[PDB]
Paper text:
Here, we report the isolation of nanobodies that bind to the Omicron BA.1 spike protein by screening nanobody phage display libraries previously generated from llamas immunized with either the Wuhan or Beta spike proteins. Binding of the SARS-CoV-2 spike protein to the human ACE-2 receptor at the cell surface is the first step in viral entry and blocking this interaction correlates with neutralization of infection. Structural analyses have mapped out the epitopes of these nanobodies on the RBD and have shown that the majority cluster in two regions: one on the side of the RBD, distal from the human angiotensin converting enzyme-2 (ACE-2) receptor binding interface (cluster 1), while the second are close to or at the ACE-2 binding region (cluster 2).
The monomeric nanobodies were each mixed with a hexaPro stabilized version of the BA.1 spike protein trimer in a 3.6:1 molar ratio and then vitrified on cryo-EM grids. By contrast, H6 formed a complex with the BA.1 spike trimer and an approximately equal mixture of the two forms was observed on the grids. In one, an H6 nanobody was bound to each RBD of the spike trimer in the so-called ‘all up’ conformation, and in the second the RBDs were in a ‘2 up 1 down’ state with two nanobodies bound to the ‘up’ conformation but missing from the ‘down’ conformation. H6 is only able to bind the spike trimer in the ‘up’ conformation, with the epitope partly inaccessible when the RBD is ‘down’. In previous reports, and in contrast to other SARS-CoV-2 variants, the stabilized Omicron spike trimer has only been observed in a ‘1 up 2 down’ conformation in cryo-EM structures. H6 binds directly at the ACE-2 receptor–RBD interface and completely occludes the site of ACE-2 binding and corresponds to Cluster 2(21) nanobodies.
Author numbering:
A (entry chain C): 1111 to 1144
B (entry chain B): 918 to 1144
C (entry chain C): 725 to 838, 845 to 1062
D (entry chain B): 628 to 673, 686 to 724
Write the structure that this text describes.
Amino acid sequence: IITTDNTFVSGNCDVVIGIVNNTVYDPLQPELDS
Amino acid sequence: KLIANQFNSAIGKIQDSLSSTPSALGKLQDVVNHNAQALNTLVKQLSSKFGAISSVLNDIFSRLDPPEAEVQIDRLITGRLQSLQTYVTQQLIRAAEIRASANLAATKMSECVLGQSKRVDFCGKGYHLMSFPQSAPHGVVFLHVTYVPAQEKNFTTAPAICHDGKAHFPREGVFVSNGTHWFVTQRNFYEPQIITTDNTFVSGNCDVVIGIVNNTVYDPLQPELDS
Amino acid sequence: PVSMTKTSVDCTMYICGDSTECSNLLLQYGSFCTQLKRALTGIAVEQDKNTQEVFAQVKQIYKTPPIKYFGGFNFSQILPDPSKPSKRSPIEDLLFNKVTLADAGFIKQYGDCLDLICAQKFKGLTVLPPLLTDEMIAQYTSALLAGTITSGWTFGAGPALQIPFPMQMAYRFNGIGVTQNVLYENQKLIANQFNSAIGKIQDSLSSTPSALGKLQDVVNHNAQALNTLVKQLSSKFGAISSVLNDIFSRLDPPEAEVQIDRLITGRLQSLQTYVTQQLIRAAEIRASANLAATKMSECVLGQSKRVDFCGKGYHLMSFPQSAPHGVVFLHV
Amino acid sequence: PTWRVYSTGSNVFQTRAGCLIGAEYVNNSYECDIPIGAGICASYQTSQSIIAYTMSLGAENSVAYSNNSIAIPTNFTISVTTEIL
Ligand SMILES: *[C@@H]1O[C@H](CO)[C@@H](O[C@@H]2O[C@H](CO)[C@@H](O)[C@H](O)[C@H]2NC(C)=O)[C@H](O)[C@H]1NC(C)=O
Ligand SMILES: *[C@@H]1O[C@H](CO)[C@@H](O[C@@H]2O[C@H](CO)[C@@H](O)[C@H](O)[C@H]2NC(C)=O)[C@H](O)[C@H]1NC(C)=O
Ligand SMILES: *[C@@H]1O[C@H](CO)[C@@H](O[C@@H]2O[C@H](CO)[C@@H](O)[C@H](O)[C@H]2NC(C)=O)[C@H](O)[C@H]1NC(C)=O
Ligand SMILES: *[C@@H]1O[C@H](CO)[C@@H](O[C@@H]2O[C@H](CO)[C@@H](O)[C@H](O)[C@H]2NC(C)=O)[C@H](O)[C@H]1NC(C)=O
Ligand SMILES: *[C@@H]1O[C@H](CO)[C@@H](O)[C@H](O)[C@H]1NC(C)=O
Ligand SMILES: *[C@@H]1O[C@H](CO)[C@@H](O)[C@H](O)[C@H]1NC(C)=O
Ligand SMILES: *[C@@H]1O[C@H](CO)[C@@H](O)[C@H](O)[C@H]1NC(C)=O
């Protein structure tokens, strides 16, 4: 699963050729919402 | 501070080792000795008679008629030419060895001084850090500085740890324990650390790995940041 | 290939045996024996040095633990066994049987010499035994293998540190970009594949089409050079006879001198040609020895990232095996 | 003719390389010296006499290899070596 820990963010979505819209799952907020 | 002190001491010992009597520059001296003995043999070869009446061209010409003085000097010429071609052959044979040595020296220069080399036992013995060259007569001297560990200790180790039915694997370290507790540390130095979520990664369940140990893994997030 | 057979030549009797007059005749020619003797001695010294450089690389003699279970992996076909006077692996024994077709002779005590070595020996062509013996070479290989198996690469960089075998393979696969859990899940099948490959190695070697032509080539070249040097003696060289006694008793002094001189010159040319060939062969002999030493240092003592250096593919391990005048590596 | 080396200088030693005269074989495997073929290095030792023996390749060792047992270094050393080409 492509999570926040599996990838690093750099730049925006208008400079890379072939970038694909896809969700990235946060392993922090949803279950550890206490 | 300690590393610099060790480096300075090691540099100091080099001077004493070199200035001491058992010189290690046998390689450079061997070439000079070989060349000197070759030239000595060649210069002494002129004394060989090669089956002639005398080795003096003037004496042979004065005290002998041309009809066979011609063949005497001819044979002397053949012998001397044989000596020269032999010497040239020896020199060009040694030339290939010199070329190979120079090529190896240049390669080591480039791969050890211009950068850090991972090749085993190439730039010295151990873990090469950097190198220093020194000019020598008909040669070069390299000074390789390497990393040598010491004072090892023995700890119980496990391939992985299962926490909640899932196996946990070290990220860039090993699992160690000198008994009760378990710790994660780097391979090349003892630096035990608490096993946490960021220290390891989960890969599948914990009933397929051989040697796994059921131990807890700490969460550095929930117990404090529970607000 | 590693080393080639050390030999010595007795110039004074080769040029003329049982001829005192020829001994005086050659004396007036000066010295064409000091230099060829020096060259032969240097060749032999380099030959011994090549083997010493290749094999003498560890200061400690390591012994395998009595238990021979290492993650289920097989090592029996490469470990030496005490069931033989020579503690050689069965692969080593197969190699020795394969290459033992041509050899130095295994005997140099002259007691059995009253029919090929003796013919050359009677013409003053001797062979000097190597400094290191096969027992010592096999001991070197066994110590290297034991240190490798028991420590990894730590023994190659100082003090040997024990480390579980599957753990060590795990870190090694981590060294090629593969996570250790792959091994920790596929260990049994990996060991099965390794054992199958090791077993197939044995039948590949024991099969008829031997690929060990490299080592045989050196021995054949040395033998052929020796035979042609021997046969060059019978040449007339423009003389009347090739027999010293015949040419002496059948001829007067004032012509017998140049008669002997012509043969002396011809045989001297033969000797100088032979020694030049010996040097030019020792050239690539030393080159191959250096290459083998570098390869064993970079593949046996550690894991190499160089492409197609330690085998084909992604190198893991390279196991050395002693060979007659050579060494054999098993690249994983 | 006159070159005889007395009548018996020492116990004559028969080797693979030939016959050795003037030295005594010992059963102590020392480090190498002026070498003889087939793994014999002759040395001058203790009064003082020339002795022959068999090569000792190195000190024996045995790593305590075991399950789940690992050795982790805690000290380190900085080493400098000199090489001549
Ligand atoms: C490492 O663990 C082992 C435990 O097996 C210890 O090694 C001892 O090593 C010596 C010589 O190498 C052997 O004679 C002993 O038999 C070994 N001990 C045992 C219990 O077998 C050692 O104490 C530990 N520590 C270090 C630094 O080696
Ligand atoms: C193994 O070594 C670690 C490292 O020293 C030991 O951890 C110590 O544990 C005691 C127990 O209260 C603490 O007071 C120390 O502060 C700890 N040291 C460090 C550096 O954190 C551990 O006790 C050792 N033995 C085991 C794990 O059985
Ligand atoms: C490694 O494989 C060899 C295979 O030869 C094992 O040696 C024995 O070899 C004979 C003849 O090939 C077989 O019939 C035996 O079955 C083999 N023994 C075993 C136990 O397989 C050698 O024992 C193997 N090594 C280990 C550690 O088992
Ligand atoms: C590794 O061992 C060496 C052994 O010499 C330690 O060197 C000592 O360092 C201290 C502090 O600098 C000095 O007071 C001692 O005199 C040094 N020893 C000697 C024999 O002179 C070194 O500190 C150790 N380092 C580590 C990280 O363990
Ligand atoms: C993703 O969708 C948004 C929708 O407006 C669009 O603007 C953007 O270009 C898309 N990016 C990619 C990589 O398809
Ligand atoms: C996991 O924990 C259980 C406790 O019920 C234990 O029996 C088992 O041995 C543990 N697994 C290990 C140590 O690999
Ligand atoms: C694991 O332990 C057993 C029992 O002591 C032993 O026979 C085996 O060789 C060990 N395996 C290793 C150290 O890889």
